[PDB]
């Protein structure tokens, strides 16, 4: 469209991609956070590691990326690259292999009200501990601990969308059966630093089919 | 148009004063930037003995003072901390020299915190595949000594100091490993006389 082309030209004429997108500085961004699981690849009992395929649904708001639909051709949705916009750094703490950041080849979705929706896919090697006191008649519990690495509770406030991980697109395993996977928000304080950091912990509770 | 206080502050620091990350903040000639660092262990995950590799996630808090990154607080309606990505400002390249792979540096490169003082703090997330030798005489009733050597590849002692803050590495977010036991974590600063 010509109007969508003009909107994309107008939208990114001046956009600092490294400042946090609040109108007033003493207001935190509110990042609605949800994780979805495609499959549970393997849980290495010997190495105590856990490979998962996760989609990281993140929804936030931006004061500078809002427009009028009646003046721009009736357009209400834009696709932008993830490299041009500001985006948070949700990093899982208990990682065990490689880098921590998720890549940016996917595309965000701008609604005209400023709502930005970003869905990166990722593999994760969590490092949950296992107990083998019963074998193979055992139930195991493994945790993942997502959260912003740098920003405070007064600059990022995390909010869960649902109350559990999505198992709607879950590819069956055939070896491990998921009983329940809840998610819990905590506000914790580390001994390095004098300020409170929030985080979201998911807890898979699986059982081996023996 | 409508801008933040932080957007105006970021316009005034970097692009106004023509900030360059390649040259170090020395007020005069032969000044030692006293950078200081301390380690916090998070989890022992592998102490692999056949390959002689330990893997640990550590939090190395290293901080210094950069005089070019100062601003007045009451001019920009009150901002005392300001966070910027790490590939725009000066920072020393302190890494391991004993690892099994070739990856010295941190492959994450998060953002870092600068205050109104000019005091810059940087705490990168990192897992390391350190390489330590195994004393395997009293198997399995054995002690293991494994070391981590942090130093920089660009600068040297004539251009930067390196001040160890606490004598022992902290044990704060530590999850107990189940196989191994940490009993003491000392740390020291090695300099060679008659070898600057």
């Amino acid at each position, epitope marked *: 469209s010509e109007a969508e082309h003009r909107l994309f030209e107008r*939208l990114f004429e001046d956009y600092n991609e490294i400042i946090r997108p609040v109108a007033n500085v003493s207001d935190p961004v509110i990042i609605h956070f949800e994780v979805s699981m495609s499959q549970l690849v393997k849980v290495d009992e010997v190495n105590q590691i856990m490979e998962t395929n996760l989609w990281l649904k993140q929804i936030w708001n931006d004061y500078k990326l809002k427009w009028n639909p009646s*003046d721009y051709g009736g357009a209400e949705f834009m696709r932008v690259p993830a490299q041009k916009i500001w985006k948070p750094d949700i990093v899982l703490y208990n990682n065990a292999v490689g880098d921590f950041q998720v890549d940016d080849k996917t595309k965000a979705l701008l609604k005209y009200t400023g709502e930005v929706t970003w869905i990166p896919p990722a593999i994760f090697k969590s490092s949950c501990k296992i107990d083998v006191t019963y074998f193979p008649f055992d139930y195991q519990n493994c945790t993942m601990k997502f959260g912003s690495w740098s920003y405070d509770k007064a600059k990022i406030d995390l909010v869960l969308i649902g109350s559990s991980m999505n198992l709607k697109d879950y590819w069956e395993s055939g070896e491990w059966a998921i009983i329940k996977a809840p998610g819990y928000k905590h506000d914790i304080k580390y001994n390095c630093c004098e300020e409170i950091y929030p985080d979201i912990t998911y807890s898979l509770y699986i059982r081996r089919l023996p | 148009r409508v801008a933040n206080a932080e957007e105006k502050l970021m316009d005034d620091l970097l692009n106004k004063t023509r900030y360059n990350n390649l040259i170090r903040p020395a007020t005069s000639s032969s000044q030692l930037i006293s950078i200081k660092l301390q380690l916090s262990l998070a989890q022992l995950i592998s102490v692999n003995e056949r390959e002689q590799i330990m893997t640990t996630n550590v939090w190395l808090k290293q901080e210094w003072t950069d005089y070019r990154l100062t601003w007045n607080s009451s001019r920009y309606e009150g901002v005392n901390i300001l966070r910027i990505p790490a590939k725009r400002i000066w920072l020393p390249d302190i890494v391991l020299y004993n690892n099994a792979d070739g990856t010295y540096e941190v492959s994450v490169y998060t953002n870092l915190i600068v205050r109104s003082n000019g005091s810059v703090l940087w705490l990168p997330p990192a897992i390391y595949k350190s390489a330590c030798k195994i004393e395997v005489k009293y198997f399995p009733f054995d002690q293991q000594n494994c070391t981590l050597k942090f130093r920089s590849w660009t600068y040297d002692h004539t251009e930067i100091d390196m001040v160890l803050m606490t004598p022992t590495a902290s044990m704060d977010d530590f999850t107990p490993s189940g196989e191994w036991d940490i009993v003491a974590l000392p740390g020291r600063r090695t300099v060679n006389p008659q070898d600057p």
Partner: antibody
């Protein structure tokens, strides 16, 4: 869609003044309010922008220590106060509501109060 | 920071004649808006984004320009077109209006 203001007022110099702007016929949130003054030389200037959902004001650097811009979300009415009035303030004052998207233009205009010092 | 200057200040044209008004800037910009004020009334939004007409605007007009030069253009003059036209920008802090070209008969 209508905008109503106050009437013309006579203010002796050294005395503050407060003028109002009430909007109807549309949702009063999601549109920002602009205060625009027009002198007798037909060379009209800009004073400030207020956002009535949050109160995030942004003044002009010429008029920073003279204007005070407030809202009233219960009755959908904005207030503007000018202090330390001099002889260069006998002008026409407009309140203008416009959508805060990328046109960034005054979509609707008020009748225009008249202030004589 | 950008100061806008129009040309001319007072002008007139017969009905059925091309009318060209120029708005000039100090530094460079890309998008600039145009407002019409008639005699004794309030202004209306007239042209936005340098070429796009507003809702209740007849299709006789055309805006064009870039850099530091912009121009409003009227193909068919009419007797109901005597007004004052203002050019305004928002790309640099603060919001500045033009001088105002007055078009009459």
């Amino acid at each position: 869609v209508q905008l109503q203001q106050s009437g013309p007022e006579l203010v002796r110099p050294g005395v503050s003044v407060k003028i109002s702007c009430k909007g109807s016929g549309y949702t009063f949130t999601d549109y920002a309010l602009y205060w625009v003054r027009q002198s007798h030389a037909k060379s009209l200037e800009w004073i400030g922008v207020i956002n009535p959902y949050s109160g995030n004001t942004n003044y002009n650097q010429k008029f920073k220590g003279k204007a005070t811009m407030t809202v009233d979300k219960s009755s959908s009415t904005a207030y503007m106060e000018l202090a330390r009035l001099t002889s260069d303030d006998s002008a026409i004052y407009y309140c203008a509501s416009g959508y805060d998207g990328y046109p960034y233009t005054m979509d609707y205009w008020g009748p225009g109060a008249s202030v004589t010092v | 920071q950008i100061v806008l200057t129009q040309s001319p200040a007072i002008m007139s044209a017969s009905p059925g004649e091309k009318v060209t008004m120029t708005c000039s800037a100090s530094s460079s910009m890309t998008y600039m808006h145009w407002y019409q004020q008639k005699s004794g009334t309030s202004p209306k939004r007239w042209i936005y984004d340098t070429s796009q007409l507003a809702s209740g605007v007849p299709a006789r007009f055309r805006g064009s320009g870039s850099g530091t030069s912009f121009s409003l253009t009227i193909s068919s003059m009419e007797a109901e077109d005597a007004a004052t036209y203002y050019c305004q920008q928002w790309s640099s802090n603060p919001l500045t209006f033009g001088g105002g070209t007055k078009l009459e008969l």
